[PDB]
A paper describes a structure:
FGAR-AT encoded by the purL gene is a multidomain bi-functional enzyme that catalyzes the fourth step of the purine biosynthesis pathway. The FGAR-AT protein from Salmonella typhimurium (StPurL) has 1295 amino acid residues and is a single chain protein with three major domains. The C-terminal glutaminase domain produces an ammonia molecule that is consumed at the coupled active site present in the formylglycinamidine ribonucleotide (FGAM) synthetase domain where nitrogen is incorporated into an FGAR molecule converting it into FGAM. While the FGAM synthetase domain and glutaminase domain carry out the two enzymatic reactions within this bi-functional enzyme, the function of the N-terminal domain is not clearly understood.
However, F209W mutation that was expected to block the cavity at the expense of some clashes with the adjacent Leu182 and Glu186 residues was made. Surprisingly, the F209W mutation was very successful and had expression and purification profile at par with the wild-type. The crystal structure of this protein was solved by molecular replacement at 1.5 Å resolution. The mFo-DFc map depicted clear density for the tryptophan residue that had adjusted into the structure by adopting a similar conformation to that of the phenylalanine residue it replaced. Per residue rmsd of the region around the Xe3 binding cavity was calculated between the F209W mutant and the StPurL-Xenon complex and it was found that mutagenesis at position 209 resulted in a local readjustment of the structure. To accommodate the larger tryptophan residue, side chains of amino acids in close proximity of the original phenylalanine residue like Glu186 and Leu182 residing on helix α7 readjusted adopting alternate rotamers. The surface exposed lysine residue, Lys608 residing on a loop spanning residues 601–613 which, lines the Xe cavity has the highest overall residue rmsd value of 1.7 Å. This loop showed maximum perturbation of the backbone in the mutant structure and is a part of the long linker region (601–631) that connects the B1 and the B2 sub-domains. Other residues in this region with average rmsd over all atoms greater than 1 Å were Glu184, Glu186 and Lys196. This result demonstrates that local perturbations in structure can translate into movement of residues in the outer shell of the cavity by propagating adjustments in surface residues and that cavity 3 exhibits structural plasticity. Out of the three internal hydrophobic spaces marked by xenon atoms, the region around the third xenon site was found to be most malleable and tolerant to mutagenesis. This site was more surface exposed and although mutation of F209W resulted in perturbation of the local environment, the changes were tolerated as is evident from the crystal structure.
Residue numbers in the entry: -9 to 448, 466 to 1295
Write the structure that this text describes.
Amino acid sequence: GDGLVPRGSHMMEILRGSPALSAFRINKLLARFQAANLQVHNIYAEYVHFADLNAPLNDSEQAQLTRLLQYGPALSSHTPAGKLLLVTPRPGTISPWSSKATDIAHNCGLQQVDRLERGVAYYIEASTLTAEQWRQVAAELHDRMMETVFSSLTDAEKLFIHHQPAPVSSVDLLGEGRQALIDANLRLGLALAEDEIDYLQEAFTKLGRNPNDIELYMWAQANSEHCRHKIFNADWIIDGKPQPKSLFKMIKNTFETTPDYVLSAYKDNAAVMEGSAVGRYFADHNTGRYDFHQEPAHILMKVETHNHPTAISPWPGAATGSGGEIRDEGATGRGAKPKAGLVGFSVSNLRIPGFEQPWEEDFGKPERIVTALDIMTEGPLGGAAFNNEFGRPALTGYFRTYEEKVNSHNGEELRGYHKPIMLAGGIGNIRADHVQKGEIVVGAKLIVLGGPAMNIGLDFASVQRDNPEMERRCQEVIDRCWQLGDANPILFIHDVGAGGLSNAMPELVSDGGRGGKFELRDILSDEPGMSPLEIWCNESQERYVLAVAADQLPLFDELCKRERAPYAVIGDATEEQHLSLHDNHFDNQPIDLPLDVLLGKTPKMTRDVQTLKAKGDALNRADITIADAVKRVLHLPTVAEKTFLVTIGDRTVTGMVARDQMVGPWQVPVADCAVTTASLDSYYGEAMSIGERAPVALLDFAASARLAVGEALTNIAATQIGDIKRIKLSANWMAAAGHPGEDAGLYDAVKAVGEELCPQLGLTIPVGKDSMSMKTRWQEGNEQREMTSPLSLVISAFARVEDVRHTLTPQLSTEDNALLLIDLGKGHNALGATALAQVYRQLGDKPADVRDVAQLKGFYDAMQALVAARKLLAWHDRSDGGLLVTLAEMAFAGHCGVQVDIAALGDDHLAALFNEELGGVIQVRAEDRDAVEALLAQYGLADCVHYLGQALAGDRFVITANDQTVFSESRTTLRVWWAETTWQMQRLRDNPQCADQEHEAKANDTDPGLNVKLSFDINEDIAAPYIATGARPKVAVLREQGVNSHVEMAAAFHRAGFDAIDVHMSDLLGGRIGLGNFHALVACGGFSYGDVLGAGEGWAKSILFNHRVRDEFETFFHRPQTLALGVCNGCQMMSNLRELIPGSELWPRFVRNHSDRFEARFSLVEVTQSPSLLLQGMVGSQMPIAVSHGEGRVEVRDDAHLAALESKGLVALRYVDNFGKVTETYPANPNGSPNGITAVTTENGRVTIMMPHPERVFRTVANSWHPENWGEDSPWMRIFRNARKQLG
Ligand SMILES: Nc1ncnc2c1ncn2[C@@H]1O[C@H](COP(=O)(O)OP(=O)(O)O)[C@@H](O)[C@H]1O
Ligand SMILES: [Cl-]
Ligand SMILES: [Cl-]
Ligand SMILES: [Cl-]
Ligand SMILES: [Cl-]
Ligand SMILES: [Cl-]
Ligand SMILES: [Cl-]
Ligand SMILES: [Mg+2]
Ligand SMILES: [Mg+2]
Ligand SMILES: [Mg+2]
Ligand SMILES: [Mg+2]
Ligand SMILES: [Mg+2]
Ligand SMILES: [Mg+2]
Ligand SMILES: [Mg+2]
């Protein structure tokens, strides 16, 4: 029995959970203790759960809560032995696990559960340790920024203390004069300048009353660099001359020059451009039926950063970087839908233990920030965690490491990224009539949509918190709103970000020309102790603010309750330009201000600065040889394979991904840009690419900015766009403002792109952001040390795509071919600030640059001509690592060799191979060489174009210069060297057995890559005679909160002839839908409940513990002809419903992958013989499918049960390796399932559950790789057509 004790006015139940760490993780902890000379004999860990109860549980309810808290892999249980150390979230914080677990308990009828929380009990046997050594063990077992260690289970009562509300505090300006403001500036950390204090002193002296702490804090956050963008609005004097434009006005110059296709710039928290008229697919409000709505799907774009918080706590730093940016996209106009993301990281050197590289030197770091390696281990996991649980694919990115002592603009100093760049961005779609914000009527209701707040954000104040499923529930309300078209009730919406409601609400009513009257105690709160300052100014996540007409509140409440999206009306818009915040608890008014006070500011800044310019130093080549440089450059993280950043993030949710990072049958992550379809019924789409080249700014500020723009365009150039004016840019500027030379260099770089290169090319920059404190200082010896970033412009390019099918990738063909270099460097072959210089600890002399603007435009326009005429077999641009890395990566992606001659590229073979000038390599059919050279010559490119040679079958990578061999190596050896960084990252972050299997597989050149064998005609629509009758059977497309894959599931059943109906679990609980009216149902994928309490478990136990809904599902599954499919999260849910499903007694559980990591893979499976009616006709076929899950490993009770499942013949799909054999080796089997199993059916074949996603790849265009001869339908369309034909 579980523990039960008094806890304040409540009772606290303590429930023992399952064992918490796998064998490999226990071994790593033992190894770390041994490495610290901590003599630890054994460690075992178990989860422990704490339930704060507001009322007692009866026996039945106690058994339900016990069953809710049974989840996870069935690991080795041990009797507790040794010293207990209980690690929990810090008191005063509430984990996201708690928010979601508590939501499951309430949706299971346990309203007595006020809050659930979890810790980890470690039992350590180490009898000889001293007291100081026990503190070191404790330090090893928790994150000091987020957790605490306790010595008894009962200490967890500290996490549930209820504090009385703290009152507002007055700052006594009337009674003390200006010193009260000086004291408050220090006490509250307002970082006010003297002229900011003068402004506040006069404003309150004029009002004749003391400011409250909340009103000072709100104003300080509104007037910070971060929020007010004073540097980008400043006036400048440079070298003694006043300049005519601010940095923002030079950005806006690009929209004054090129307004084409722009629908919204600089007036929302994303830009919008024109898209394409296509079928937007969603379920109608009245009927619940999914349908296509033919209309423009315009395209929104935004890119943000989260640099400071990621230096302190990288997982939530990066997660809430993604999360914040997703809210900016959904809050565009009057509501919009995010569709695909991008991610970037810049960090200092990794210094992976046991894999030190020769250019890396430990310079030390501040105590209070984490290392570059910790950022790259936990940060990409947090950004992926948000994109995967919210449900947007993450399809392009960058990752740079840089940290070196260099002779730059301010002479010799350390330049790097101890404060990293953490960048998150994406694209979304929006309806034309919702692009413009609406008018806010006087008396509009002012709402906060989203998460109850806590005291987050005000280094503890820099530790963020992410709950992506809350954001998905809010996106579903936003989507119901814009799907109502003219009846959309949102008049105005805005994300909540910096400053919390203290910035978002004043900005909302101000942007509508109104004031606002608000009620503090109507805001939802999970921390009753919070003061009015903490309630109004915290930066809790997953919130939006909205205005809605009072007469639309009943509709808005219906939409929210159906999605389980929390919301509160907290105020009313007023005609008076005033802002007031009242407190019904203290019967007072924490804020009472004219908006022109609140939104008043100090004068415009002037920045008077001078130019600094480094003299470059020629590269010292004494210890450089071509062969050693190839090996070093392939080991630079910036160049090396990025799998560890790619397969951790879904790349298929939505079913609209055409081109992801992984390319070809060997799934090599070298795609130069991302492409999505605009709908599920079109080949129009959208593309995203990134350019960045920060190390060049250590030699030439403007050259680094022009190369960022040029590389974004060379990355996107082999996608079918047409007019260069379709491409729109985000410009994200990271600098150390104030550091010598960086200010004049920022202005020079903004002018270089905004006044010069982008207007000359026809490129708009309609959105951007800036982060202006990119440096770190600490005391290292008893000496001051500093690490300052280069000026770091990241350009993201976004474009409407005219046909996604015509995109080229770096996969070489071995058909008769020609490789052509387009060298936009014009033979300059610069080596300054290249990966070659960096790997020999140098900066060099002169960097690359845009050498000829008309030739850059001509190269783009020539590429677009060649793409549209279908004249290219492959493209890959030149960037980090030069021509050598471009050619190596094309041979990796084509799994072949190259024979290249570089005698035309200069006598300096090192510079010809390793310069990072713009350009790239095209591959064409040999019969088309002369035509393509003439086409390039009509764009002015003839002297830039050079025939290099040919791609050849086999494994030789050969570069010659006339009769001399310059470099020759096995392509497999190069490919494995270029994989060693991801190998080492995966092996320190994930199960090392799996990291090792994936790496070693790359060294087998005989791998034939993904390949297909089909047992049926993929073009035969067996459902066509039924569709032609017009009789369309319904399918219940089942979703729970946190499901994210329902739209494409409905679209696959719709193509097979069904009427797809949106059935939320709330519809079944509210009686709006009854399963008796359906003959088919599908449980869809995603992250219901964030997978807390085990993937699929909350959704299944919600059904089981409501007897009415339980019986509905049992009745459905017991009818004689009904069909059901569960995919991914649906598979997990239905495996937890066995008890309701006949013929399911042998089904396994689905638990954490053996790798211990989310796996987003394009995996090969074979269809096996089973009763499944949904796989009729397909037995023996082998083809790839989208895999995207963290808990897909089949787990049985013991081998008796595996053998029985097998002998009953219910396995319907198995993972196979590329040789065709059933496998458990990773990642060909991505999850470790026994015998490759990844789909099972019932004895009667009418219910099938599977972990992969056929509905993400039912369109050939959405398959990462596929045979060239396939038509619109992939093989997986046959599952949906078999369901239609079976219904008859
Ligand atoms: N941080 C990241 N997250 C996700 N994908 C990434 C990341 N960094 C790089 N990638 C992807 O890895 C591949 C190789 O990246 P990279 O070599 O930096 O591209 P390029 O050199 O073409 O600019 C590309 O498909 C890129 O989108
Ligand atoms: Cl019980
Ligand atoms: Cl990702
Ligand atoms: Cl059945
Ligand atoms: Cl499960
Ligand atoms: Cl088979
Ligand atoms: Cl393909
Ligand atoms: Mg690259
Ligand atoms: Mg590229
Ligand atoms: Mg790049
Ligand atoms: Mg065409
Ligand atoms: Mg119930
Ligand atoms: Mg694979
Ligand atoms: Mg194996």
